[PDB]
Subunit: 328 residues, 3 copies
């Protein structure tokens, strides 16, 4: 049935946010979002629905829609409309900007796909980043219709007392970090995301956890305030980068594992940098550092035979990628 | 006569600002600029003269100069030197920065032409945007020689009373929007621009009017203050985008008409976004949103046979483009 | 001996900052840095050591390492860690960020090398600019570990009294300008840099001096405060641009000499522009204008046979380049 096929496409799209392609993973992600906030989940699901539908509308590639490569940007768009809204939860007028920007996502996903086709690089979350930055800059904190949360630059020296760091909460920053990929902050939605990643590919889960831990640790090395690390606002740019470089767009080897860790460090430090730069505009560093760091690590040309950049036409999940590479 | 040939080249250049190639259209545009401000028109005409002359100087392509593709950036440069100047009208020292930056325009127009040659995209107004942003950032509001008008970010919630909107002035925002392509604000110079566009291609006029109206309407959907919409500071990024996607760089079809309308919406919202971001630097969103939106709509790859991206070597005006396409 | 080979590679790397490839030039540059500040020189030398070492680590090209194209970014990174540090000289904890960012430089140098390979353009200092901007934005002035010097935008009209300009100091801005390529401010380290450039290629020295003078003069045309020009914060973006366009990446001709002067003007004005824009973030215009101006002048396509863009595989120094061109 066409309706069932479209629903399958929309679940897969949700999943593609943590680099997974599995309807069960998508349904678990939706369950976790319902655990966090029903309003956020409704906005995100509507966003991915509109993104996929307009992907079909503008005669896009059927395989890309069927694999969810046109619905992962929309779900994030809806979620961070619902996160960076000052009007409070269940503000139904916020759905209209979700409509417009979700329809706008595939246009960017195709234009940037044409730009990044020469060098064979994925668009990543760049269509989303552009769309949500456009929204949060066009509106800002001072609308009468769709205001946003006020983000301000640091103007005083932070007070960090290292003798009162909560190590248990610091370790809790790992599951919370895997859940800020969607902007959620509940530890249990993070655990649900871990399970959803594991049911598809265990190596994706391992890289996500190690990247979140590594983004935490990189945040502690520049005296980032403890409140953020606990929420994960430090961890997420690192999870996506680690999953990207570990086994998704390379072949998994120990050299590539170390390169993924290095990309996680670069993503964390670039997260701090872009969070301090984009804050003057009133904008958050919403998955820009992941995009830039993982693009600059995927463009790396090295003579090491172990670091092999897989063609984009043969990327499903790290285990299948590894088997494909040893087969050839 | 070489002098007459150069004058013909300079008139055509002026016209190329609203996507038209006709000396009569150029002379009508110059007449409209004289209606608005003799000082602004003098600065802009000198800017396009220098841009064309330095295009000949740096051994650029003869056809591009003869068709005005090297004088449209300069005229805008001169005009927005004369608009964003705090020293008042008839400040003769402002001509020297016009000299320098107009000479700088073709260099960018060729460099970005080489960058955008692989994907077959026009440079658009990017050489101008870079040049005028460079000027207005290098000087700013606090020089002793060439100060600029102070642009500040929003710091208070605007007071919009929808019961006192001037609908007649709101509809007047359409001709005013077609005149802010040159930075002018007189309704009658807008009407002169409409006539100049119509004498060449009626479809360009239709797309310009519909894009200005659409940029207006998109501005009203984010509670943009009424004073700006009336001036058109909302309308212009949409006119150029609509003319671009309607019949200039595509073949005119109903699908392409709807895509041009969508590009107009994207240009308007990106205009709001970049006007709120670039304001912190003290810079205006001078035709950046048109460039970005129309590039991201011209890079779109779709399977729909009706959306055909014309080769850049066969783009004159939408009617000729349509006849060329049906001929082949 | 491998140790001697690595030391030779590291000296050459230092030199490549002023577009020179000569171990004697490198040792003279290190001597000049020791004249300026032993702490800055230690940080910069450690930075280039780490950059070269990680270039070998990530299986990069042997010829590029042996010619120093992977150590020039690191030395600048270390130097401007030591310049933009608020903790004072001999703050040993600053070495760790130097480690991390110097290791990060070759990754960007390879990624951007792959991007700029299609159009045959050099990466320039872009890997460095990205790395140091990332550092100075991630930390800023308000850390507890690695604070930076506070940079603020202009908020009042500067008071310039042209009747009390120090012409001798103004002329001293030329050697000081050739020394701000490394962030040093001593006139004598500038003279040592002049000698180091001359021992390799006199034409590099001539272009550097003329570019520094031209950046000075371009700074005086926009009422730049006299204190900066004396330090050279105006001169350096122009020296590198002039050396780039004169004889390094083109064949030296009078037309190309004038084009190099024009690139110096563009670099100076873009230096002012980016110094006023990036200041709101708290960031300096650390060799961004040189990169952008010289890229936009190296992408220029002109019909003039005298302006010949040399293939990147045959660029050693302007005299050898000229002899190579006349040979073919
Ligand atoms: C020929 C070609 O480009 N194919 C191709 C294009 C794009 C992608 N991208 C992804 O799977 C993807 C994009 C973004 C993300 C995330 C989680 O950020 O994941 C795969 C294959
Ligand atoms: C002082 C300051 O900037 N705090 C601050 C730091 C980071 C962010 N960004 C996010 O929370 C965020 C959440 C989710 C995302 C996604 C899904 O891309 O991005 C906001 C505020
Ligand atoms: C081979 C090739 O690129 N030819 C080619 C290059 C550039 C253009 N551009 C234009 O006509 C143009 C540029 C900018 C604008 C406006 C009004 O913004 O209009 C056409 C043909
Ligand atoms: C608060 C605020 O930013 N107001 C504001 C909004 C928009 C502009 N931009 C322009 O007026 C403009 C005029 C003409 C152009 C062209 C020819 O590109 O660009 C200035 C100030
Ligand atoms: C095939 C190819 O790209 N070869 C190639 C690549 C890069 C360079 N770059 C340089 O020498 C260089 C880079 C940066 C600088 C400075 C002082 O900024 O100088 C030469 C040749
Ligand atoms: C008000 C203001 O911005 N002053 C200001 C102007 C310019 C700079 N930039 C530099 O000093 C600099 C030094 C060395 C470099 C290199 C090696 O790239 O870049 C800092 C402060």
């Amino acid at each position: 049935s066409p309706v069932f096929q479209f629903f399958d496409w929309v679940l897969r799209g949700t999943s593609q946010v943590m680099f997974v392609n599995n309807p069960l993973s998508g349904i678990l992600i939706i369950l976790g979002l319902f655990i966090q906030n029903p309003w956020w989940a409704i906005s995100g699901c509507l966003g991915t629905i509109m993104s996929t539908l307009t992907a079909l509308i503008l005669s896009q590639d059927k395989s890309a829609i069927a694999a969810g490569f046109h619905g992962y940007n929309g779900v994030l768009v809806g979620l961070l409309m619902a996160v960076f809204s000052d009007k409070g939860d269940y503000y139904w007028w916020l759905l209209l900007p979700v409509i417009i920007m979700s329809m706008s996502c595939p246009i960017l996903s195709s234009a940037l796909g044409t730009i990044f086709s020469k060098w064979d690089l994925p668009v990543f979350t760049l269509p989303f980043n552009i769309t949500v930055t456009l929204y949060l800059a066009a509106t800002g904190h001072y609308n009468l219709f769709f205001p946003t949360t006020l983000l301000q630059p640091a103007s005083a020296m932070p007070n960090i007392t290292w003798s009162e760091v909560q190590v248990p909460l610091l370790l809790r920053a790992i599951p919370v970090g895997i859940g800020q990929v969607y902007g959620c902050d509940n530890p249990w939605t993070g655990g649900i995301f871990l399970i959803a990643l594991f049911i598809s590919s265990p190596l994706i889960c391992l890289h996500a956890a190690i990247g979140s831990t590594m983004g935490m640790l990189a945040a502690l090395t520049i005296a980032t305030p403890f409140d953020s690390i606990y929420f994960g606002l430090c961890g997420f740019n690192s999870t996506l980068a680690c999953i990207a470089i570990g086994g998704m767009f390379y072949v998994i080897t120990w050299q590539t594992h170390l390169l993924a860790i290095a990309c996680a460090l670069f993503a964390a430090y670039l997260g701090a940098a872009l969070a301090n730069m984009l804050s003057v505009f009133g904008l958050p560093p919403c998955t820009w550092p992941f995009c830039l760091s993982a693009l600059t690590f995927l463009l790396l040309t090295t003579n090491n035979p172990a670091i092999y950049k897989l063609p984009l036409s043969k990327v499903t999940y790290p285990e299948a990628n590894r088997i494909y590479y040893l087969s050839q």
